[PDB]
Design an enzyme around this catalytic site. Structure first.
Site, PDB file in Angstrom:
ATOM      1  N   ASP A 315      65.170  50.864  71.430  1.00  0.00           N
ATOM      2  CA  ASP A 315      64.844  49.286  71.569  1.00  0.00           C
ATOM      3  C   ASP A 315      64.824  48.632  70.303  1.00  0.00           C
ATOM      4  O   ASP A 315      64.546  49.306  69.134  1.00  0.00           O
ATOM      5  CB  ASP A 315      63.450  49.065  72.443  1.00  0.00           C
ATOM      6  CG  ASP A 315      63.648  49.524  73.841  1.00  0.00           C
ATOM      7  OD1 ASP A 315      64.950  49.073  74.300  1.00  0.00           O
ATOM      8  OD2 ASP A 315      62.638  49.900  74.385  1.00  0.00           O
ATOM      9  N   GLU A 352      69.986  48.987  72.031  1.00  0.00           N
ATOM     10  CA  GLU A 352      69.820  47.620  72.425  1.00  0.00           C
ATOM     11  C   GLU A 352      69.943  46.860  71.327  1.00  0.00           C
ATOM     12  O   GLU A 352      69.210  46.312  70.147  1.00  0.00           O
ATOM     13  CB  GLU A 352      68.317  47.243  72.925  1.00  0.00           C
ATOM     14  CG  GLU A 352      67.931  46.054  73.133  1.00  0.00           C
ATOM     15  CD  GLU A 352      66.481  45.661  73.225  1.00  0.00           C
ATOM     16  OE1 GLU A 352      65.701  46.469  73.313  1.00  0.00           O
ATOM     17  OE2 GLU A 352      66.173  44.407  73.645  1.00  0.00           O
TER      18      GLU A 352
END
Length: 637
Positions: A315, A352
């Site tokens: 992330d 991401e």
């Protein structure tokens, strides 16, 4: 952007790891010596990295919280180690379940209490402000009884959160997920689970993005063994499990967080404003630091070995890359990807990254980042725009096709987890709005609003599923158009859990219409498992007609036909194909089981004739009603 340069910096650091440590395998096993470990001789070995401490000590229940009775011995390169001899009566030094804390003394003479950066388990007791560091030494460790499933040909990912996975307004448990949620996921036809908010985070409303203890599995849902059993049980069902890894930043907590560990603003993080993320109010890792590399790489290894995750979604990659590119952060990500793929080639890493930095998801040996997939974040943007700013008559089919075909392997999804949150709008709410709460009962009129909503919900998902990427993702609840919204206990709602849940029972209610959307999702994924269009080459689009609002394409031998026109239906509509022969309908969104009007006869034979159309050598005639999607398979005569 020099690709030869990125590889040379990576190759150099990786070579140093081999000459100064014992290679990247040994390097990433720091968790075996750092922290607190009961030895086989009954003693206790401890080690921490704290370059700016004046002294380091261990304390807790086991020594009556005497702060300085156990001093660490100071080592080279800012490290400290401690060995406590075994007790004379041969009883355990630090009992399972008891509390510990590292004591740090400053050059100022301040006495700081810290949780170890390497802790396995931390608990907040009752209504206390801070977390306690609980020593984890159970009678029986969990032994994994199932092997990894074979690497899936294509990823069909179920993005999940353990706490919100029940209908109750509370933090749901690992065990609940294991017993009640896992078999639902399997029956839907998903072969992969994206597990969010597992890495320990003190603030539940951060949805897992505010990490306090990086090696600790969140105690909210239960014990470390209960997490291991969840992954093991998932494997027995043929499902691989991915972990969300947050290595982009850390919570500013110091009492029960990684911030200010050695009493300094620059231990695991950068000194000064450069080491602080203003918008997130968090700390930023010094990826250039050798011990930060050891810490983070051992963390990746930790989640692979101890909990047997099958891969990771990193992330906040975009944040990591741009404070000019942070070459230190990218070098870590390359090393992380190298680590995962070297230990198991079948493991998966997802980035991401909204920036779309070049070569991020291509091989390292070609100067790439080494990620297997990136998120196709442009897709949900497109559906939001269309639903927000354009009447159905004005939808540009060519624009839809461009967004879906614009590609490095990406994971496609219709809506994000951010869109399920309070203040925002889901696809189901964009489509049905207020009628979501008035006409979702089968005892109510099937209004043109609900009808349009149910049909477009199926169509938007299917075209994204079939055209959008090399993998598919679905956030928990959205597979049946979950109503209302998602919210966590916080200041802004007075610690309310009322929306921190998932109403899975809505699909089981025969008197409600949510079963229609759920039925479609199950058959969509089971169809992909049979034909494998996600792993097939990119589709051949033969028609994107703006006037008729028809999108037609071929992928994996299948024929996809979409009618997005808000009113017109076509009875003798010509569609080009690549193959001659007989065609049969294998999926029809107008089926009664999907909440359609059952207008199509599925026993109908479709024959392909020699007649050039839309750049295809053959063509067939089809009946395709307004707001209906069709998939056709070529069978044998």
């Amino acid at each position: 952007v020099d690709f030869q340069r990125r590889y040379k910096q990576f190759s150099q650091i990786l070579k140093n790891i081999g000459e100064n440590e014992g290679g990247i395998d040994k390097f990433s096993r720091g968790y075996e010596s750092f922290g607190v470990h009961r030895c086989a001789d009954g003693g206790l070995y401890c080690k921490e990295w704290a370059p700016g401490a004046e002294g380091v000590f261990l304390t807790g229940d086991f020594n009556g919280w005497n702060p300085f009775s156990y001093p660490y011995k100071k080592l080279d390169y800012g490290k400290w180690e401690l060995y406590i001899p075994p007790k004379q009566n041969k009883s355990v030094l630090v009992p399972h379940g008891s509390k510990l804390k590292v004591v740090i003394t400053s050059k100022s003479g301040e006495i700081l209490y810290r949780i170890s950066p390497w802790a396995k388990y931390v608990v907040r007791e009752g209504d206390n402000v801070n977390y306690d560091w609980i020593h984890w030494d159970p009678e029986h460790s969990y032994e994994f009884k199932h092997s990894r499933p074979k690497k899936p040909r294509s990823l069909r990912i179920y993005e999940s959160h353990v706490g919100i996975s029940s209908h109750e307004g509370k933090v749901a448990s690992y065990k609940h997920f294991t017993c009640n949620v896992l078999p639902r996921i399997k029956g839907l036809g998903y072969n992969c689970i994206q597990l969010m908010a597992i890495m320990e985070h003190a603030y539940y409303a951060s949805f897992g993005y505010q990490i306090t203890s990086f090696f600790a599995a969140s105690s909210r849902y239960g014990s470390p063994e209960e997490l291991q059993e969840l992954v093991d049980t998932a494997h027995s069902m043929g499902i691989i499990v991915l972990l969300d890894v947050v290595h982009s930043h850390a919570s500013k907590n110091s009492a029960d967080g990684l911030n200010m560990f050695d009493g300094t603003d620059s231990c695991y993080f950068h000194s000064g404003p450069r080491g602080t993320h203003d918008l997130w109010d968090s700390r930023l890792f010094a990826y250039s630091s050798w011990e930060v590399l050891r810490f983070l790489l051992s963390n990746i290894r930790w989640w692979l070995e101890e909990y047997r995750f099958d891969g990771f979604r990193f992330d906040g990659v975009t944040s990591m890359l741009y404070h000019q590119v942070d070459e230190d952060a990218l070098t870590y990500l390359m090393l992380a990807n190298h680590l995962v793929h070297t230990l198991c080639p079948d493991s998966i890493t997802i980035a991401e990254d909204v920036s779309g930095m070049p070569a991020l998801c291509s091989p390292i040996s070609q100067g790439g980042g080494g990620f297997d997939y990136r998120l196709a974040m442009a897709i949900p943007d497109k559906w939001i725009q269309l639903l927000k700013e354009f009447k159905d008559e004005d939808w540009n089919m060519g624009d839809i096709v461009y967004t879906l075909t614009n590609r490095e392997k990406c994971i496609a999804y219709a809506e994000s987890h951010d869109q399920a949150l309070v203040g925002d709008k889901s696809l189901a709410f964009w489509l049905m709005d207020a009628e979501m709460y008035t006409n979702m009962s089968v005892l109510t009129p099937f209004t043109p609003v609900i009808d349009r909503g149910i049909q477009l919900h199926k169509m938007i998902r299917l075209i994204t599923h079939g055209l959008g990427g090399e993998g598919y993702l679905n956030f928990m609840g959205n597979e049946f158009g979950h109503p209302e919204w998602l919210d966590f206990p916080r200041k802004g709602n007075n610690e309310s859990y009322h929306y921190a849940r998932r109403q899975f029972h809505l699909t089981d209610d025969d008197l409600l219409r949510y079963k229609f959307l759920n039925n479609f999702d199950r058959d969509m994924n089971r169809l992909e498992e049979r034909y494998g269009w996600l792993a097939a080459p990119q589709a051949y689009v033969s028609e994107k007609h703006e006037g008729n609002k028809i999108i037609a394409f071929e992928r994996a031998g299948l024929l996809f036909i979409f009618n997005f026109h808000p009113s017109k239906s076509y009875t003798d509509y010509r569609v080009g194909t690549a193959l001659p022969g007989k065609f049969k309908i294998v999926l029809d969104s107008d089926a009664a089981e999907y909440g359609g009007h059952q207008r199509l006869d599925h026993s109908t034979d479709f024959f392909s004739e020699a007649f050039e159309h839309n750049g295809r050598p053959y063509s067939l005639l089809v009946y395709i009603p307004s707001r209906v999607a069709l998939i056709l398979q070529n069978v044998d005569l």
